[PDB]
Amino acid sequence: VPSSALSEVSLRLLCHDDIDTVKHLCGDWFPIEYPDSWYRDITSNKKFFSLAATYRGAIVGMIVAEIKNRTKIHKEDGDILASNFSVDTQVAYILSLGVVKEFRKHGIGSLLLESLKDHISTTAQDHCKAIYLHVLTTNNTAINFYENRDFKQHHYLPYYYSIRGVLKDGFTYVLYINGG
Amino acid sequence: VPSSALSEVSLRLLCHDDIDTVKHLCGDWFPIEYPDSWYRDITSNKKFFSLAATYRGAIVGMIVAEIKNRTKIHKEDGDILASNFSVDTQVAYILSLGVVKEFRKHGIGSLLLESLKDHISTTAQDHCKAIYLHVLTTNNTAINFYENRDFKQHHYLPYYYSIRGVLKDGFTYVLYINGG
Numbered sequence: 001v002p003s004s005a006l007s008e009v010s011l012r013l014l015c016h017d018d019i020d021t022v023k024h025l026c027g028d029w030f031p032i033e034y035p036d037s038w039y040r041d042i043t044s045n046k047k048f049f050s051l052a053a054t055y056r057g058a059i060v061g062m063i064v065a066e067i068k069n070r071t072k073i074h075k076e077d078g079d080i081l082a083s084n085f086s087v088d089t090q091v092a093y094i095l096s097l098g099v100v101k102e103f104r105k106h107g108i109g110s111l112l113l114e115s116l117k118d119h120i121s122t123t124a125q126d127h128c129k130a131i132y133l134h135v136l137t138t139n140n141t142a143i144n145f146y147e148n149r150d151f152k153q154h155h156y157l158p159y160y161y162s163i164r165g166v167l168k169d170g171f172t173y174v175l176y177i178n179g180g
Numbered sequence: 181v182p183s184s185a186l187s188e189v190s191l192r193l194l195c196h197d198d199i200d201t202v203k204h205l206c207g208d209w210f211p212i213e214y215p216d217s218w219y220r221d222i223t224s225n226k227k228f229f230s231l232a233a234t235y236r237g238a239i240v241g242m243i244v245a246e247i248k249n250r251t252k253i254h255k256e257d258g259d260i261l262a263s264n265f266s267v268d269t270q271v272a273y274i275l276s277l278g279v280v281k282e283f284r285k286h287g288i289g290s291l292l293l294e295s296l297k298d299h300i301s302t303t304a305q306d307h308c309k310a311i312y313l314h315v316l317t318t319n320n321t322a323i324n325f326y327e328n329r330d331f332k333q334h335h336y337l338p339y340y341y342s343i344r345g346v347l348k349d350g351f352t353y354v355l356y357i358n359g360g
């Protein structure tokens with residue numbers, strides 16, 4: 001992969017034709033398998049903001065975000081917005097950010113993140129006061145990435161057990177924007 | 181297993197010597213694997229009320245419950261107690277109830293449940309106003325068992341996905357006792 005790969009990278013919305021490719025990439029990047037309907041959802045342009053980075057026609061990275069009002073923020077993360085912000089105030093939750101391994105450290109991840117931030121800072125309907133996400137405590141690469149881009153650790157989420165399943169521990173990271 | 185097995189069943193607290201057996205039984209009954217310290221905890225008689233049913237010296241069943249004040253109730257189940265109840269008001273959460281397969285339908289499960297309820301209805305320190313538990317939507321056997329013992333469905337808990345893991349959907353079931 002050429003050092004100049006970034007200059008020839010394009011950005012576009014995901015579409016239904018991408019589903020198989022997305023599944024494959026997500027299967028490579030994340031141990032948690034979401035149901036098939038999630039993949040349709042993010043490739044539909046209705047409920048999610050999903051941007052792909054492409055190189056010579058191939059998807060080499062992607063970011064998936066959900067724009068939420070305060071009532072759709074994870075309950076354990078309700079306090080990412082101070083208590084004086086209106087319920088209609090919105091935030092962007094990063095469901096997914098990934099780049100094909102060989103294409104990493106070329107600025108693609110930063111590009112996808114910047115694009116999400118511009119999207120929610122310039123258009124009225126998706127205007128947001130924060131970006132937040134969850135990261136496993138063991139994902140040092142992602143933690144450094146976000147902290148170097150001025151996301152702050154907002155919470156530690158402890159390990160959780162139930163007959164319904166197990167949630168690993170993790171962090172809630174948050175970036176305040178546009179007066180957030 | 182004889183129809184009269186129940187008349188010869190004894191009850192006793194779990195102890196540290198039971199851990200290997202408990203682990204083996206829990207491996208058979210539940211798909212979720214809890215950390216080693218959980219097994220130590222439930223056999224330690226500190227944080228949990230854990231009763232075993234034994235037949236001819238062998239454990240054929242167990243119930244594990246946690247006595248909680250209002251602040252320790254699962255957030256999604258907080259509303260099992262009306263707001264007029266004292267903050268110190270207690271409830272019992274069933275973490276675990278299981279009977280060895282061939283000993284099932286002999287009244288052992290009911291005996292364990294009855295014992296839990298007497299423990300929290302007669303002694304002052306562990307006195308409770310409710311018993312609640314979680315059950316997977318697919319566990320018809322457990323749902324019928326509890327509903328036939330007048331537990332009522334309090335909540336549906338929907339499926340949950342995150343980078344931290346997956347929670348299957350399920351029900352919160354609740355039994356009010358002692359004026360609860």
Ligand SMILES: CC(C)(COP(=O)(O)OP(=O)(O)OC[C@H]1O[C@@H](n2cnc3c(N)ncnc32)[C@H](O)[C@H]1OP(=O)(O)O)[C@@H](O)C(=O)NCCC(=O)NCCS
Pocket residue numbers: 003029096097098099100103104105106107108109110111139141142144145148149
């Ligand atoms: C986290 C992740 C998305 C970052 O993507 P990325 O494309 O590697 O991101 P970037 O290239 O913009 O930045 C990473 C690093 O490469 C550096 N970099 C960018 N261009 C570079 C270049 N031409 N030469 C040398 N380094 C470069 C960035 O400066 C550096 O980070 P730093 O500024 O904090 O020191 C990626 O490692 C990944 O896909 N992980 C697996 C999926 C995952 O863990 N997702 C969880 C949510 S992030």
Ligand SMILES: CC(C)(COP(=O)(O)OP(=O)(O)OC[C@H]1O[C@@H](n2cnc3c(N)ncnc32)[C@H](O)[C@H]1OP(=O)(O)O)[C@@H](O)C(=O)NCCC(=O)NCCS
Pocket residue numbers: 163183209275276277278279280283284285286287288289290291319321322324325328329
């Ligand atoms: C749910 C469970 C704990 C019930 O244990 P159990 O010992 O079979 O419970 P019981 O024998 O007291 O009662 C069950 C049924 O057998 C019947 N039964 C009891 N004694 C009987 C007898 N001598 N002859 C015929 N039927 C009998 C009960 O009457 C009947 O219940 P019903 O009144 O609702 O019709 C058991 O199936 C189990 O271990 N499941 C796996 C673990 C699990 O799913 N746990 C969920 C909570 S974590």
Ligand SMILES: [Cl-]
Pocket residue numbers: 134135136139142343
């Ligand atoms: Cl992660």
Ligand SMILES: [Cl-]
Pocket residue numbers: 163314315316319322
């Ligand atoms: Cl269950």
